[PDB]
């Protein structure tokens, strides 16, 4: 259900066994979980300027 766009890379975050996604202070999604692999992936916005 979580839709968006960006670059997916590997991060060093250690989620809990009941966490799905992560949010920052400004309440923007920056990390998700793989439903079939259970891997920590971070979301970064694509380049603009």
């Amino acid at each position: 259900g979580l839709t968006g766009t960006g670059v997916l890379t590997k991060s060093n975050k250690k989620f809990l066994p009941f966490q799905q996604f992560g949010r920052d202070i400004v309440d923007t999604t920056d990390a998700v979980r793989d439903p079939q692999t259970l891997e920590i992936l971070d979301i970064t916005p694509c380049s603009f300027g």
Binding site: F18, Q19, Q20, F21, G22, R23
Partner: peptide
């Protein structure tokens, strides 16, 4: 049968900061 071997003491305390749980998964 009615084994009512329990009594209500109506006692409490003022040192329990324990009612805290996780409201969501963020």
């Amino acid at each position: 049968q009615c084994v009512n071997l329990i009594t209500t003491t109506q006692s409490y305390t003022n040192s329990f900061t324990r009612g805290v749980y996780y409201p969501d998964k963020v």
